[model samples]
Target: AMGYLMALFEDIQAVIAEQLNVDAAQVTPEAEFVKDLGADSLDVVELIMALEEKFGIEIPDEQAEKIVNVGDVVKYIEDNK
Candidate 1:
């Protein structure tokens, strides 16, 4: 289960990196999407859409706002999946 979750984290990092036009190396678990990664409001929305499509999950606005960092998104995907 741990290995699977780590793999999922890596995959999520890659997805976020692609969406943000940044290197995967820059997408640490603690990195903030807006502050550290330079993502804007629209970028975050598109990122959420990509995550939903990639993970086959729906992230409503309420849940979306709670996602503050890369690790938060990863944990959400892990837990929800």
Candidate 2:
């Protein structure tokens, strides 16, 4: 699960990088989604939608907000998996 989450993180980072036109290296585990990734509310919502689709799980906004960074998102997937 951890390995899969790591791979997911890499894939997500690549997509985010492409969307934001930035280097993947700039996206770190500790980096905040809005602050570092430059994700607006809609972007975050879309990200959650993508994650939900990928993981086959539903994430409510109340719960999703708890995930503030890439590592947190990975951990959420790991735990849910």
Candidate 3:
């Protein structure tokens, strides 16, 4: 499950990288989705959908908004799993 979640994160990074014209490796844990990656609300919503499909888990909007960093995403995935 952990491996699956990590892969999901990588997939998300790939999507973000492709969309933002940046490399996936540039998506550091400290990077904010909005400030660092320049992801807008629509991008975030799309990413959330992608994550849900990849992980087979639904991320509620209330909780999703709290995910500000890669670490937070990891923790959320872990906790839910």
Assess each prediction's global lDDT (C-alpha) against the native.
0.86, 0.76, 0.72
Tens digits of per-residue lDDT, candidate 3, 1-81, equal 778767766766676677667777878756778888877878777776776776778777788989876556656655555
Which prediction has more favorable lDDT, 1 or 3? 1
TM-score of each: 0.89, 0.75, 0.72
- Estimate the lDDT of model 1: 0.86
Across 1-81, the per-residue lDDT of candidate 2 in tens digits comes to 778757788977776676666689988778877888787878777777887897787766667888787777766765665
Q: Candidates ranked by lDDT, best first? A: 1, 2, 3
lDDT of 2: 0.76
Give the poorly placed runs of model 1, Cα more than 4 Å off: none
**Model 3 pairs whose backbones collide:** none
RMSD of 3: 2.8
1-81 in candidate 1: lDDT tens per residue? Answer: 889877988998998987889898889999999999999988888888888897899876778888878998887765666
Predicted structure with the largest lDDT when compared to the true one: 1
- Arranged by TM-score with the best first, the candidates are 1, 2, 3
Off by over 4 Å in 3: 1-12
- Candidate 2 RMSD computed on C-alpha atoms after optimal superposition onto the true structure: 2.2
